[PDB]
Amino acid sequence: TITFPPLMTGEAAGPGQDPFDLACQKAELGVDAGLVVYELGTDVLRAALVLAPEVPLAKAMAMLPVCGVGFQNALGALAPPEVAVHLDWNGALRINGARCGRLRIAASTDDPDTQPDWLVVGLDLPLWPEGDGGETPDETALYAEGCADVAAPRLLESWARHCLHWINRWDEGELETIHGEWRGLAHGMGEARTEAGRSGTFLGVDEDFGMLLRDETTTHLIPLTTVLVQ
Amino acid sequence: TITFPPLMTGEAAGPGQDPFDLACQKAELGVDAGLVVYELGTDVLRAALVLAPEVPLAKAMAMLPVCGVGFQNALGALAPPEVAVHLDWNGALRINGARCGRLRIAASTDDPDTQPDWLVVGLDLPLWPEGDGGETPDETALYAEGCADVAAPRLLESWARHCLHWINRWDEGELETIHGEWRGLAHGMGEARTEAGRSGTFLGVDEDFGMLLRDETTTHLIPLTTVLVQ
Ligand SMILES: [Ca+2]
Ligand SMILES: [Ca+2]
Numbered sequence: 001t002i003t004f005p006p007l008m009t010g011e012a013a014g015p016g017q018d019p020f021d022l023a024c025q026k027a028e029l030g031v032d033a034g035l036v037v038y039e040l041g042t043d044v045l046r047a048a049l050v051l052a053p054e055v056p057l058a059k060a061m062a063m064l065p066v067c068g069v070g071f072q073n074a075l076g077a078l079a080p081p082e083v084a085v086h087l088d089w090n091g092a093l094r095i096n097g098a099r100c101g102r103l104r105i106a107a108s109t110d111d112p113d114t115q116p117d118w119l120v121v122g123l124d125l126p127l128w129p130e131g132d133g134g135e136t137p138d139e140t141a142l143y144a145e146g147c148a149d150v151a152a153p154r155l156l157e158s159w160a161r162h163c164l165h166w167i168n169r170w171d172e173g174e175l176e177t178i179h180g181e182w183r184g185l186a187h188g189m190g191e192a193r194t195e196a197g198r199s200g201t202f203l204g205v206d207e208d209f210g211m212l213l214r215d216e217t218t219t220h221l222i223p224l225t226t227v228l229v230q
Numbered sequence: 231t232i233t234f235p236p237l238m239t240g241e242a243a244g245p246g247q248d249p250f251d252l253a254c255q256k257a258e259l260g261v262d263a264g265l266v267v268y269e270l271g272t273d274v275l276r277a278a279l280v281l282a283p284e285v286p287l288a289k290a291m292a293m294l295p296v297c298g299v300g301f302q303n304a305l306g307a308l309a310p311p312e313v314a315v316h317l318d319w320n321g322a323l324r325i326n327g328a329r330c331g332r333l334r335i336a337a338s339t340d341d342p343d344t345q346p347d348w349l350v351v352g353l354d355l356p357l358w359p360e361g362d363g364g365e366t367p368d369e370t371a372l373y374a375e376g377c378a379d380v381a382a383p384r385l386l387e388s389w390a391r392h393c394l395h396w397i398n399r400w401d402e403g404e405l406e407t408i409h410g411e412w413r414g415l416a417h418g419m420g421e422a423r424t425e426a427g428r429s430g431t432f433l434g435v436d437e438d439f440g441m442l443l444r445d446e447t448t449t450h451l452i453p454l455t456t457v458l459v460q
């Protein structure tokens with residue numbers, strides 16, 4: 001039994017359905033915020049949250065870092081303390097330095113100025129490595145990294161709970177604290193980076209979590225809207 | 231603009247729709263928890279919340295007292311301190327001792343042992359008295375009772391916020407504290423009462439908020455399930 005906070009609604013994905021796709025489909029059909037679509041296998045955990053923040057898209061993109069912090073907190077509550085989680089700006093997850101899943105984000109609009117009707121954040125997390133020869137960016141899997149005592153259902157519940165904590169704080173105006181939490185977890189800050197066909201040093205982020213990428217002569221601003229799933 | 235907490239979804243009632251009925255209709259159609267249907271006029275405020283507590287109906291009935299406490303807290307935050315709010319066991323509201331609206335409750339089942347698929351709590355609050363000659367239990371109206379500086383939209387927002395606070399505490403196991411808050415607001419406790427065709431002294435309530443009604447020779451238990459809208 002998967003128990004979510006009050007006013008979150010869990011829905012297991014059925015045949016032909018995957019969580020991120022289904023949550024987006026349901027969101028476009030008018031299903032409200034608070035839906036958590038999930039799909040658990042022995043080798044993978046997928047889940048997706050439907051949100052509706054009443055701000056322009058530019059600002060609603062903070063839901064990605066917010067749910068990343070949620071995930072880091074959720075795994076830290078369940079895993080051995082030596083397991084390090086870092087968050088890539090683009091939503092990729094790293095466990096003990098290795099690519100191990102990702103957070104995805106979609107919304108009802110791609111205009112930075114428009115308030116979206118909906119936004120969905122999806123988690124994909126490998127639990128055991130898939131060795132079938134399917135193309136993957138993942139370099140490890142959760143249970144390969146010392147987290148064998150972490151149950152997938154409990155991790156899902158915990159992600160939902162910690163995401164809700166940070167989303168509520170974001171709503172109460174605590175963006176600055178969120179920025180600080182996220183900066184401490186950010187992968188590769190201060191280091192070389194290629195992004196959106198540009199290269200430089202990942203200097204940090206602006207208030208809307210846009211990447212500041214400094215090359216030899218200029219600083220590029222890459223808005224976080226660029227990672228929206230099209 | 232009516233702003234609700236994150237993961238609450240406001241929906242204004244359209245032509246042919248009223249909040250409590252519509253929320254129940256939508257709930258039976260599968261709309262999840264967190265919907266707040268509302269309808270504001272100059273003379274009346276109506277609203278309804280869709281909930282889905284994962285407990286048997288017997289225990290889910292606590293949502294009525296919970297949302298009553300929510301309302302008392304919400305009005306107290308906005309009204310002059312001399313305005314007294316009391317809660318009837320059956321959901322009726324009293325302002326300065328006079329009947330002035332009510333909370334209603336419905337659910338997907340009437341079996342006390344079954345976990346309901348949904349529960350809806352509705353608020354009906356008169357703002358000015360209706361003098362058209364329509365039959366009403368109400369003896370006053372909010373703006374007749376010194377609350378002219380309370381805006382209906384702000385009261386609605388506040389009800390939603392305070393209900394969510396108490397529903398979250400209920401979920402975290404704080405039933406005992408809820409009982410205490412509710413007992414302090416209860417109308418007519420320790421006094422004569424007629425209920426479900428029985429008469430006696432309203433002694434108090436059991437853990438499931440069932441009324442203990444003591445007559446000359448016995449104590450009746452009236453379960454709160456009896457106030458479910460059929
Ligand atoms: Ca699937
Ligand atoms: Ca109507």
Ligand SMILES: [Ca+2]
Pocket residue numbers: 007009032033034035237239262263264265
């Ligand atoms: Ca909802």
